[PDB]
Design a protein around this ligand. Structure first.
Ligand SMILES: Nc1ncnc2c1ncn2[C@@H]1O[C@H](COP(=O)(O)OP(=O)(O)OP(=O)(O)O)[C@@H](O)[C@H]1O
Ligand SMILES: C[C@@H](O)[C@H](NC(=O)O)C(=O)O
Ligand SMILES: [Mg+2]
Length: 323
């Protein structure tokens, strides 16, 4: 395709770059853009043919539905029904790193976007580049994470280029994404709200708002976020010794406060500042897989606050888990 990489300021992006992106979207092209969570790979959400390209480019199963990104509460009314009782909730978290499942109203959103489901995943991203792009473009943007399906979600343009140079016309670069992890997904169609994916809106906070929040087994347990070398997640750190010596040709991903115990290690971040771990975990997976070792070994973390989401991701990535 011959890919343009256009840098923009995250607070006040050059509207001329956004205009170029909007035009491509109008032509039924796919572009890659930043959000506060991860980079997205997006098309016109009302354009069936363009959204099909997203699947082709990611090598993604058709049964995996796309999140529809909006910039206003007015757009919500166009695409979803039955949200009215949750508007107070939404106005508290949007724009922000929250995706919500509602019943689909719109026949404007083709089946391919929603994988033939009667629900639609909606997100209003708290990233001025995304917001302004959507607004200028004039339609919602359907976009999964910017990565080959199965691989770690891009949190910077480097990762995007690894996966997509030559495959898309335009990548908008606004640097490293603030959170580094995908949005919290909460299903609001059932009588009790269901957490479908942990993220920057933390479980603890959702439990405060929704005492009856249901957290399914698949969230707490186990394609997705997986490096090219095998991944060994060590929840029980007492076995760390056993593991290193069982898998000798390795690189470790570890926290700051245990860096000087490993020989060959990438420091993902500090337990002192767990948002640093979230921000960097996917980069760390991509660095690791390069460091020419046979095995990537990752320390486990508390299943609390943002590290809950981190652990969700690592569990879905791991080739073996050590409990
Ligand atoms: N209506 C819906 N019902 C249930 N889950 C939904 C719905 N709409 C979107 N989702 C979820 O939204 C998530 C979007 O993630 P994304 O599109 O980046 O793909 P992924 O699962 O991370 O895989 P990939 O490796 O291709 O990125 C998926 O986990 C999908 O289950
Ligand atoms: C692109 C970004 O918004 C992302 N989308 C996805 O994972 O499909 C998210 O929900 O955080
Ligand atoms: Mg994804």
């Amino acid at each position: 395709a011959s890919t343009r990489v256009l840098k923009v300021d995250p607070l006040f992006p050059d509207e001329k770059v956004l205009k170029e992106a909007a035009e491509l979207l109008r032509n039924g092209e796919v572009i890659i853009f930043p959000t506060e969570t991860v980079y997205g790979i997006g098309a016109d959400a009302y354009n069936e043919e363009a959204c099909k390209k997203i699947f082709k480019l990611k090598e993604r199963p058709a049964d995996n539905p796309l999140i529809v990104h909006i910039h206003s509460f007015k757009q919500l009314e166009e695409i979803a029904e039955g949200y009215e009782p949750h508007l107070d909730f939404l106005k508290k978290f949007w724009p922000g790193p929250l995706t919500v499942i509602f019943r689909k109203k719109s026949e404007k959103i083709p089946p391919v976007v929603t994988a033939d489901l009667p629900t639609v995943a909606v997100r209003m991203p708290a990233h001025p580049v995304a917001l302004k792009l959507i607004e200028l473009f004039g339609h919602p943007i359907a976009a999964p994470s910017a990565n080959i399906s199965g691989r770690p979600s891009a949190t910077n343009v480097k990762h995007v280029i690894e996966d997509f140079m030559g495959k898309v016309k335009l990548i908008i670069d606004a640097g490293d994404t603030p959170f580094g992890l995908e949005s919290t997904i909460v299903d609001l169609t059932k009588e009790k709200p269901v957490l479908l994916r942990p993220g920057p809106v933390e479980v603890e906070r959702l439990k405060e708002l929704f005492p009856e929040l249901v957290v399914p087994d698949f969230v707490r347990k186990g394609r997705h976020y997986a490096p090219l070398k095998p991944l060994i997640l060590v929840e029980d750190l007492t076995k760390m010794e056993e593991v290193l010596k069982k898998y000798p040709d390795h690189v470790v991903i570890c926290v700051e406060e245990r860096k000087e115990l490993y020989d060959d290690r990438i420091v993902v971040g500090s337990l002192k500042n767990p948002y640093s771990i979230a921000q960097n975990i996917f980069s760390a997976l991509r660095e690791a897989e390069k460091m020419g070792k046979e095995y990537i070994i990752v320390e486990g973390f508390e299943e609390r606050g943002i590290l809950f989401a981190v652990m969700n991701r690592l569990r879905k990535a791991a080739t073996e888990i050590v409990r």
